[PDB]
Amino acid sequence: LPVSMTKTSVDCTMYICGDSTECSNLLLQYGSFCTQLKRALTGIAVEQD
Amino acid sequence: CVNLTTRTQLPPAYTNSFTRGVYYPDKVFRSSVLHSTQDLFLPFFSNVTWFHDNPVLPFNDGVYFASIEKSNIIRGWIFGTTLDSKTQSLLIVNNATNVVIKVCEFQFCNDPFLDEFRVYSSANNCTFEYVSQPFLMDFKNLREFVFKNIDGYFKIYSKHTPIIVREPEDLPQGFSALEPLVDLPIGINITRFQTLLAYYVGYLQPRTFLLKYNENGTITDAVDCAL
Amino acid sequence: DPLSETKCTLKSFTVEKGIYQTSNFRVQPTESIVRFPNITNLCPFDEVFNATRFASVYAWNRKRISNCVADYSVLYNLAPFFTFKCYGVSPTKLNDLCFTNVYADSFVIRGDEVRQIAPGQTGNIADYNYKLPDDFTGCVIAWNSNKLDSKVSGNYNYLYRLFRKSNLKPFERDISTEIYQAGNKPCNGVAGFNCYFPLRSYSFRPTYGVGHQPYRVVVLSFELLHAPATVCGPKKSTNLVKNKCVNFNFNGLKGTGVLTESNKKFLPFQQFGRDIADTTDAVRDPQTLEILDITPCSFGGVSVITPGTNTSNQVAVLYQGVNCTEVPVAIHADQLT
Amino acid sequence: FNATRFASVYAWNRKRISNCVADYSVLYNLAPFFTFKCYGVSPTKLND
Amino acid sequence: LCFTNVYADSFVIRGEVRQIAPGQTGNIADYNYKLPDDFTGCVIAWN
Amino acid sequence: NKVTLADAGFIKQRDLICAQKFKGLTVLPPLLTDEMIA
Amino acid sequence: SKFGAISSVLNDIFSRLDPPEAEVQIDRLITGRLQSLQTYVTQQLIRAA
Amino acid sequence: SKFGAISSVLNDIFSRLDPPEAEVQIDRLITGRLQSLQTYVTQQLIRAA
Ligand SMILES: *[C@@H]1O[C@H](CO)[C@@H](O[C@@H]2O[C@H](CO)[C@@H](O)[C@H](O)[C@H]2NC(C)=O)[C@H](O)[C@H]1NC(C)=O
Ligand SMILES: *[C@@H]1O[C@H](CO)[C@@H](O)[C@H](O)[C@H]1NC(C)=O
Ligand SMILES: *[C@@H]1O[C@H](CO)[C@@H](O)[C@H](O)[C@H]1NC(C)=O
Ligand SMILES: *[C@@H]1O[C@H](CO)[C@@H](O)[C@H](O)[C@H]1NC(C)=O
Numbered sequence: 001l002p003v004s005m006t007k008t009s010v011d012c013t014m015y016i017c018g019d020s021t022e023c024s025n026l027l028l029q030y031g032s033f034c035t036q037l038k039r040a041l042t043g044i045a046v047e048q049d
Numbered sequence: 050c051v052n053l054t055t056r057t058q059l060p061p062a063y064t065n066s067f068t069r070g071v072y073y074p075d076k077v078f079r080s081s082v083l084h085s086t087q088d089l090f091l092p093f094f095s096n097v098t099w100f101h102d103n104p105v106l107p108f109n110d111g112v113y114f115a116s117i118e119k120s121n122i123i124r125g126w127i128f129g130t131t132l133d134s135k136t137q138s139l140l141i142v143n144n145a146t147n148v149v150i151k152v153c154e155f156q157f158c159n160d161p162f163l164d165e166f167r168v169y170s171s172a173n174n175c176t177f178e179y180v181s182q183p184f185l186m187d188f189k190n191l192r193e194f195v196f197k198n199i200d201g202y203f204k205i206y207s208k209h210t211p212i213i214v215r216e217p218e219d220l221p222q223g224f225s226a227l228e229p230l231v232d233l234p235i236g237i238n239i240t241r242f243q244t245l246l247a248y249y250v251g252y253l254q255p256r257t258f259l260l261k262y263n264e265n266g267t268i269t270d271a272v273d274c275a276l
Numbered sequence: 277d278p279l280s281e282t283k284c285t286l287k288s289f290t291v292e293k294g295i296y297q298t299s300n301f302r303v304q305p306t307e308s309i310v311r312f313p314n315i316t317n318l319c320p321f322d323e324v325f326n327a328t329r330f331a332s333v334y335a336w337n338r339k340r341i342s343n344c345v346a347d348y349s350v351l352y353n354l355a356p357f358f359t360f361k362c363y364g365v366s367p368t369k370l371n372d373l374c375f376t377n378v379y380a381d382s383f384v385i386r387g388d389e390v391r392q393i394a395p396g397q398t399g400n401i402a403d404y405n406y407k408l409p410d411d412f413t414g415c416v417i418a419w420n421s422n423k424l425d426s427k428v429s430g431n432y433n434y435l436y437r438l439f440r441k442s443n444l445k446p447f448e449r450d451i452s453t454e455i456y457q458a459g460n461k462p463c464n465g466v467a468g469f470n471c472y473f474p475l476r477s478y479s480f481r482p483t484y485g486v487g488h489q490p491y492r493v494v495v496l497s498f499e500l501l502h503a504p505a506t507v508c509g510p511k512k513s514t515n516l517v518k519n520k521c522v523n524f525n526f527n528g529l530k531g532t533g534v535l536t537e538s539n540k541k542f543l544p545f546q547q548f549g550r551d552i553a554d555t556t557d558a559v560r561d562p563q564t565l566e567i568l569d570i571t572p573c574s575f576g577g578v579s580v581i582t583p584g585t586n587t588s589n590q591v592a593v594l595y596q597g598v599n600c601t602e603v604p605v606a607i608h609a610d611q612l613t
Numbered sequence: 614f615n616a617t618r619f620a621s622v623y624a625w626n627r628k629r630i631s632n633c634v635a636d637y638s639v640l641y642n643l644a645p646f647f648t649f650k651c652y653g654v655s656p657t658k659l660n661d
Numbered sequence: 662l663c664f665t666n667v668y669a670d671s672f673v674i675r676g677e678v679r680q681i682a683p684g685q686t687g688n689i690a691d692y693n694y695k696l697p698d699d700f701t702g703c704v705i706a707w708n
Numbered sequence: 709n710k711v712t713l714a715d716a717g718f719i720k721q722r723d724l725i726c727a728q729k730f731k732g733l734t735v736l737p738p739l740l741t742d743e744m745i746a
Numbered sequence: 747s748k749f750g751a752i753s754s755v756l757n758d759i760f761s762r763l764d765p766p767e768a769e770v771q772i773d774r775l776i777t778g779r780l781q782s783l784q785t786y787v788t789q790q791l792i793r794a795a
Numbered sequence: 796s797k798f799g800a801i802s803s804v805l806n807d808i809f810s811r812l813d814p815p816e817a818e819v820q821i822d823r824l825i826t827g828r829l830q831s832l833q834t835y836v837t838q839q840l841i842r843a844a
Contacts, residue, residue, distance in 0.1 A: 006714075008734070008790070016780065020756075021530075033784075045736055078540065078549040079550055080722075201377070201379075266542075352687075369764065395815060396813045456657075469641055470656070684766075698765065792840055792841070
């Protein structure tokens with residue numbers, strides 16, 4: 001029976017805006033998407049332990 | 050006034066195309082990456098026209114070419130739409146030192162050979178000129194060629210292998226990816242081609258492939274998605 | 277401090293006892309490297325824009341530009357340039373990009389058909405004479421030529437095709453003139469009913485209004501880099517700095533990373549190099565002709581371990597995925613950041 | 614086209630012609646057709 | 662609508678008149694007159 | 709020896725499948741190691 | 747994926763197109779990558795359940 | 796549903812308008828249909844759980 005899963009962490013300011021351009025200033029006006037995605041991933045990482 | 054040599058008829062036989070006709074579609078280095086390509090390729094296990102001869106063969110999508118000769122007998126290629134001194138005609142020759150590529154509306158003998166060279170008897174307007182390293186090298190000596198004309202370019206893919214292959218129609222198996230040699234920015238329309246002097250004539254078509262790059266970036270295998 | 281950063285990420289003034297994943301650190305580049313090829317020869321724009329006589333609409337010329345340094349700022353005063361609508365590329369960033377295949381066209385049309393030479397738009401000169409593709413990148417330049425191409429009796433060397441079987445494929449020419457069949461009886465060289473000459477002539481005398489005067493059009497169809505770049509812009513070169521985080525600009529390809537030795541077995545026709553995804557991993561120097569692998573800068577997750585503001589104020593910083601011999605020690609010069 | 618008496622050029626009539634299909638292919642049985650130089654839409658684009 | 666701080670720049674340029682826009686370059690933009698990138702006003706021309 | 713793990717949350721130093729770290733995908737190691745589960 | 751834009755790379759858009767028209771296509775990639783991250787987070791939440 | 800475009804018929808956009816603004820009015824339909832398919836797949840995955 002499976003018990004645990006892997007714990008992944010996603011960097012939004014390197015995945016969407018690939019850290020070589022200056023589109024991170026355009027990502028701040030999109031709200032709080034990557035706050036709740038990081039919080040959901042942190043909660044998943046807590047639940048896997 | 051032409052040096053015509055009457056040849057026998059000998060209607061051409063057909064052989065198989067196991068894994069040949071695969072080139073490098075782009076100039077991007079990939080290593081240990083399986084990649085898909087929607088470029089014009091040769092279909093796997095298809096019929097190529099075996100000759101043992103210089104007919105008037107159409108072009109119409111691009112042409113794969115192969116040759117197995119010990120000495121350099123097959124030596125040149127002629128391209129164009131209508132070879133009747135009304136449209137531009139691309140020319141490729143392989144002398145002992147260089148390769149002379151000219152785009153003129155030539156008038157030449159209907160069955161020409163090089164060693165006389167009734168291939169450049171008249172010339173009016175030289176549109177392009179090109180002199181570089183020889184395309185060929187200076188039972189054995191497999192010489193494969195991929196010719197296609199798309200987006201104003203005449204790209205030539207080639208690779209030479211010293212094969213030891215027997216006498217029947219047994220165009221050899223295994224994989225050998227043809228590397229690009231030149232790309233000429235010509236806007237010529239090509240609907241027919243002729244050869245100069247056992248060769249093979251292939252026909253390309255848009256197919257989907259699944260390429261396989263090794264740790265060195267050499268294409269070791271491919272999978273045709275419509276066989 | 278990381279305590280107030282944890283307070284800012286949680287949007288509160290009192291944090292609780294536990295670990296919190298704050299924002300991440302990034303090793304920022306210090307220099308900027310621009311590397312352009314060896315060429316210095318100016319692009320032949322005097323033989324294209326300032327030519328004496330252009331061609332017709334159905335028989336337009338195609339000038340091939342390769343291995344040149346194209347300065348586009350000198351084109352603004354040789355001609356008035358009353359329209360500079362560029363499709364896909366901005367006109368201001370054109371001097372900082374390297375091109376591969378630059379094909380220059382040349383024809384002269386009427387003043388009310390400047391809207392027709394465009395992607396997608398049809399008409400009489402863009403349906404039977406010169407069709408632009410729906411993915412056409414480049415600029416369409418046109419200026420008024422009432423003082424150089426309008427005879428008082430009328431110029432008659434400029435023609436246009438009004439009768440043609442089907443719509444032309446993109447970037448094609450039709451210079452064959454025959455009597456267009458449109459009726460029952462074959463024409464056989466008779467200009468009767470439903471048998472018309474295709475190449476109708478123009479008429480340009482300086483008495484018409486602005487809109488029927490002839491306009492000299494030079495279409496610059498560009499092809500961006502997927503190959504060795506022949507045509508580039510007037511940008512100065514910079515000495516290549518390796519083993520450090522720099523902002524690289526290789527023939528228009530920009531980015532940020534560390535350029536080192538690649539040790540790859542590149543073939544002499546390949547310029548770029550990629551990874552599992554479709555991003556640039558390897559690159560070739562246009563001046564040294566050596567291959568370099570592009571590696572992103574040092575980074576990682578930053579976690580702040582706090583015992584809570586109700587007990588203490590000191591915290592502990594956890595750099596996730598970073599070896600302890602690769603912790604950023606460059607905090608001494610943070611004014612350079 | 615196939616009438617009997619025509620009007621003068623100072624008393625030229627104007628009949629409003631509408632609400633049909635417009636077949637322009639009946640203009641071929643006459644005298645050999647000295648003038649069809651159009652100033653607008655092409656003759657091949659009249660039937661659409 | 663309503664505004665707070667309405668300014669009025671007075672200058673006469675020949676033409677060259679389209680180089681005052683933000684982004685458009687020339688001998689007016691970086692030498693004579695510069696419009697901001699967040700320009701939220703009017704540009705009215707005369708004869 | 710029959711379940712081949714991919715990353716296991718360890719520190720990263722011819723490119724492997726772990727090139728997703730450069731695009732922002734980082735795998736965290738578990739709190740309880742296998743020596744503690746044993 | 748381009749998501750209706752002219753290039754998938756974020757670096758050859760701002761050096762190609764001007765501040766105004768660059769935005770239309772930067773947002774086309776941002777709203778595509780955010781949707782991909784949202785689908786990944788939703789499927790990871792279902793797998794965690 | 797047209798998702799804000801001119802119509803919900805695919806060939807009517809090509810017949811009504813022309814290439815430059817046809818793709819700005821058909822991507823709004825394609826992205827909307829992809830989002831509806833992703834919503835259907837997410838709801839079917841919840842129902843499968
Ligand atoms: C571009 O200019 C350089 C400068 O002479 C040419 O030669 C290179 O010189 C540097 C320093 O002397 C060497 O490290 C390179 O190996 C040289 N390059 C080659 C290909 O030998 C260079 O040949 C010129 N051309 C190109 C295409 O780079
Ligand atoms: C090739 O042609 C031969 C006869 O010309 C035929 O028997 C054979 O089936 C053909 N091959 C294919 C794959 O159709
Ligand atoms: C790839 O490179 C290695 C190292 O030189 C070599 O041993 C191997 O034979 C090469 N493979 C091919 C297919 O060339
Ligand atoms: C971290 O650095 C040390 C010091 O050289 C090295 O021995 C070790 O292999 C590195 N990696 C890990 C995962 O500890």
